[PDB]
Structures are given as C-alpha cells and as structure tokens.
Assembly symmetry: none
Homo-oligomer: 106 residues x 3
C-alpha cells in the first residue's frame, strides 16, 4: 500500500501532522521500512501499524481536499509540458518553465 499521489500528499502536508500521526508513516514513506519492520521497532502488531498509517492517510486526504496542493501541482506540470511542446526552441520560455517547475518542486 504505497502510491505516488499519497507519497506526494505526505511530502506536501507532513509538516501539519502531529508526532503521533507522523511517526509510522514517516518511517514507511521516507526511511523505507516495511510495516513489519515498523511493528518490530515499536513492539506492536502489524495491523496496529497498518491502522495508524491508514488514519494518517485520511488526514492527508482531508488536507488535500482543503488546500489542493497536489491536484494543482499536477495541473501545472501538464500545462508546462504543453508549453514546452509548443515552444521547443524558445529559450526565454524554457527558462521560465524551469523556474516555475522548481518553485513547484519546492
């Protein structure tokens, strides 16, 4: 249970999470532990880790419904790609897109 969108929601909103909401999912998304490894580290069950992570995932979705940083990031990249495809030899536009893209990736 790992997807690019949810990974992205985690990267966008992690700073909004509490410690308790954060711990497991951070280990899973950023440090790369399996749920078993997380359960072993904490002396808890595998389902427990699964349950905690699922709750935080709904929270991340709630933030996405409110702020839309992910859907808006997707829309912009698609528009930037169209622009690039449209103006393959315009240096000034390519640099603009380069800066926007970097602002979006930060």
């Amino acid at each position: 249970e790992k997807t690019n969108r949810m990974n992205a929601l985690f990267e966008f909103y992690a700073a909004l999470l509490t410690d308790k909401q954060m711990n497991y999912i951070e280990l899973y998304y950023a440090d790369d532990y399996s749920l078993a490894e997380i359960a072993d580290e904490f002396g808890v069950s595998r389902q427990a880790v699964y349950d905690n992570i699922k709750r935080t995932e709904k929270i991340l979705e709630t933030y996405e419904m409110k702020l839309h940083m992910y859907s808006d990031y997707v829309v912009r990249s698609e528009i930037f790609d169209d622009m690039i495809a449209h103006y393959p030899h315009d240096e000034y536009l390519q640099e603009k897109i380069s800066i926007l893209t970097s602002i979006d990736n930060r």
Copy 2:
C-alpha cells in the same frame, strides 16, 4: 548580409574568451568596431565571402555555448527579478544599493 542583434552581441560578449583567435577576430571587428564585411576582408587580405562564412560559423558556435551554459537567459531572468525587487521596495536604499551591486557583477 548578417543581421546584428542585441542577443547575438550579448552572446559574443559572454563567450568571446572561449573562441579561438580565428573564430573571434572577424566577429569582434563586426560587432565591437562596427566594421563592414568588406572592410574586414580588406584588412586581412581575404574575400568577403570568407569573412561572411567565418562570422556565421561563430554565430552558431555562440548559440551552442548559450544552449549549454545559459549565461544570456540567466542574465535576462536576473534582471527581471531585480526589477521586481525594486518595484517591491521603492524606498529601500539598502536594497537599492544591493541591487546595484548585483547588477554590476552581472554587467562585469
């Protein structure tokens, strides 16, 4: 017929040092000293066609350097951002002095 432009003049100023002597001598007289193709050819004892083809060769080389290093487009962007900053801080003398220092490192 070779059309001078501000971008091309700027690529030359940015990348001149990368050119070999033969790549640089004619285009330098053309842009920096406003020589005609005929005058260059007369000075060096060669045909106008030869000067013409040489300058076109360099122009392509300059355009390849820009595609690799982007000193010109980066310079355009920096000045736009500096202009933004000046409009944002109309009366900040300190900011104004900084921008003026950055601008001159950019103008060398």
Copy 3:
C-alpha cells in the same frame, strides 16, 4: 586526488563543454563517488591512466573558470545574498527571491 567543493562546482558548471572522453572518469569520480581503482576496473585501464585523465580535465575546468567566472560570480553573489538575508531575516518575499536567484545558478 583531493576532492573539493570548488572542483565539484567547476565540473557542475562546465561539464556540458566537455567531450565524453574528458568527462567520463571525473563524472564517476565526483557524481558517483567511484574510487580511481573502480574507475580503472570499469574502463579496463590502469589507475595512472585514470589519474592523468582527471588531472587533465581538472585543468580544462580551471581554464573555463578563468575565462567565464561562473563560479566566482556565484560565490560573490552568494555573499551578497547572505548580507541581504542577515539584513532582513523575517522578510519572506526577500527570502523567496534569493532562493530563486540561487537555484537559477
């Protein structure tokens, strides 16, 4: 060969000017952290050949830096950007401008 932040940066600024033959080894050395031995094993050559070729590319990079000054201009601007941030530590719009200027570079 002592690695430095400066040479790393020279490589990063001018690599596009290098031929594959000038770039192959130094690229592995700096970007991928290969040792000279690993590089030599990969290309089936001696360590000395690897050592000579990197030293040569380094010299070529130093030449680009002396002609173009991209790295020194970057170090000087950075210093000017640091003065500005020290001057206005709580100015987000300024901070943002500086991050962009810095990434352009």
